[PDB]
């Protein structure tokens, strides 16, 4: 039997509860620039002895697409595993190229929607900011909600501090942003949201930008590109904080 059902007001209750779970989640944000996308999030820890470097809240789906979440982490982990699986089997093995951001986002939304309409399963308690690049649509940033609804954004924030983060991004965001300025604005918005310690180990950033052939892992095939997604290391974030 279905666990997600329409209430007399027409709302889906479990979807509202999953959105509440998301609103309790840690703040994460993404900013779309003229020459890239930056998606950032802060990393709270279960203990000071926990090795936070083992958990990545920003994950690569395809070498040109990456996702960050807000809400329940295990749900995000399984949903990312499924997203990678489908991006490979249902698109790349068929067409020889990785799906564009729009189609992969549609497929993630499909996965999340099925949990909203199948019996014996609750909705995913996460919202995703999926940033990617593709040749025909360019850089794009999508937010995906527990219901499977997704919209494109110039900049956005999800989680606990989403309201203040979005109010700040509306003021800061503008056209002709270069990706370095987008990173700067992302770090400022994330600093204003984090009440704890703020450094390269409590913050996680990744960018969709220029192709990185050095990360390709091989040479000699001129037509292979190299990932556009790249996580900023702890030191790379720290050096930028030292110039904030």
């Amino acid at each position: 039997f279905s666990l997600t059902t329409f209430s007399p007001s027409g709302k889906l209750g479990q979807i509202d509860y999953a959105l509440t779970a998301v609103k309790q989640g840690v703040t994460s944000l993404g900013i779309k620039a003229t020459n890239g996308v930056v998606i950032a999030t802060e990393k709270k820890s279960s203990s000071p002895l926990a090795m936070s470097e083992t958990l990545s809240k920003v994950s690569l789906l395809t070498p040109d697409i990456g996702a960050v979440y807000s809400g329940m982490g295990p749900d995000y982990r399984v949903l990312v595993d499924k997203s990678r699986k489908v991006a490979h089997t249902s698109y790349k093995r068929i067409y020889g190229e990785y799906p564009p951001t729009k189609l992969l986002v549609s497929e993630v939304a499909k996965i999340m929607q099925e949990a909203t309409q199948s019996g014996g399963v609750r909705p995913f308690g996460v919202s995703l900011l999926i940033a990617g690049h593709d040749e025909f649509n360019g850089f794009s940033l999508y937010q995906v909600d527990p219901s499977g609804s997704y919209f494109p954004w110039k900049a956005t924030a999800i989680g606990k501090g989403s309201v203040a983060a979005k109010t700040f991004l509306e003021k800061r965001w503008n056209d002709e942003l270069e990706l370095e300025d987008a990173i700067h604005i992302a770090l400022l918005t994330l600093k204003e949201s984090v009440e704890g310690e703020f450094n390269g180990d409590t913050i996680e950033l990744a960018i969709i930008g220029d192709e990185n052939p050095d990360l390709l892992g091989y040479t000699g095939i001129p037509t292979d590109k190299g990932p556009r997604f790249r996580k900023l290391t702890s030191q790379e974030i720290n050096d930028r904080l030292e110039a904030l």
Binding site: R93, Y95, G96, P100, L103, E135
Partner: protein, 203 residues
Amino acid sequence: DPSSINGGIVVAMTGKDCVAIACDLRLGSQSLGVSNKFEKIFHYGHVFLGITGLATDVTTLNEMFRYKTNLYKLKEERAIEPETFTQLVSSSLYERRFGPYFVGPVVAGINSKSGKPFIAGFDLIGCIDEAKDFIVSGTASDQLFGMCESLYEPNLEPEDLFETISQALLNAADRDALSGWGAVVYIIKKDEVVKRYLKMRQD
């Protein structure tokens, strides 16, 4: 040999900024010639597919690829490109590998973004054979191989490309028992496609 039942041949060549694909029109039941109107070249936008081999499989794959490219265009809001379509054809042949289709496809087209010629073929091993000069398929593949290998030269103008490919097809078809009854040549450019029917031996 299922591919030899109906016969027919397809050849694709690359010119200067343009592509040509040509095929014979004969459909036959082995020795008996049935139809002179069975065109083996289909297009799914700006990308052309010539399919030789068993005629039922040719029709089945034409229907299947029309379906798949229509869905691709609806979902992606863009037309499928020659390279993406080559990958799609390769994967679709593989999905039936055990109990395969008895066909040899030939993709021909111009990539709309880069605007440069593309032709590709698929062999029995299923390996994509993307060629800079020409692809041949069908019963007269040997005749076509020698003919194209002698006549082809790089960077042919469209009017010279037409003559080269039409002569290659006509002289190979003349020496193949199961090929003939007319030929059609497509000259594919950035902006237009010209379809021509060739005068040839009707025996």
